[PDB]
Amino acid sequence: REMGSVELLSREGEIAIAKRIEAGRDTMIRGLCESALTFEAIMVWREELGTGRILLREV
DNA sequence: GCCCTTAGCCCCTTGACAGGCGGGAAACATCGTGTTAACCTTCGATTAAGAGTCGCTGAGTCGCGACG
Fold this sequence. Notes:
It comes from Caulobacter vibrioides (strain NA1000 / CB15N). The chain is mostly helical and 59 residues long. Helix content is 61%, strand content 0%. It has helices at 2-6, 14-32, 37-48. The radius of gyration is 19 Å and the shape is elongated. The structure holds one DNA strand of 68 nucleotides.
């Protein structure tokens, strides 16, 4: 009943939902890469990577 | 008849295995993940041919009175 009387089958809106998810990921990445501990933690963690730490598949 | 001498049994010391639970080291069969992108975006049973009663709900009928 919830699926039918409430939810409506998204016809040709799958690509729109995918683009919305991509936009949300872009917003999250833009908010992450800013002046805060996230940029310092990602930069400090990446400093050890590349030579003696995980350079690929983890960053 | 008693004491001395010697034999047999019991006990102690060493030991050359034998293999035997068991962790380690290794070779090999599990167990939880992923990942792929060419087409359908409501599936389905199951009482319901006897019988005594518990727990709740919602319709049609009346009183009490006020305003003309």
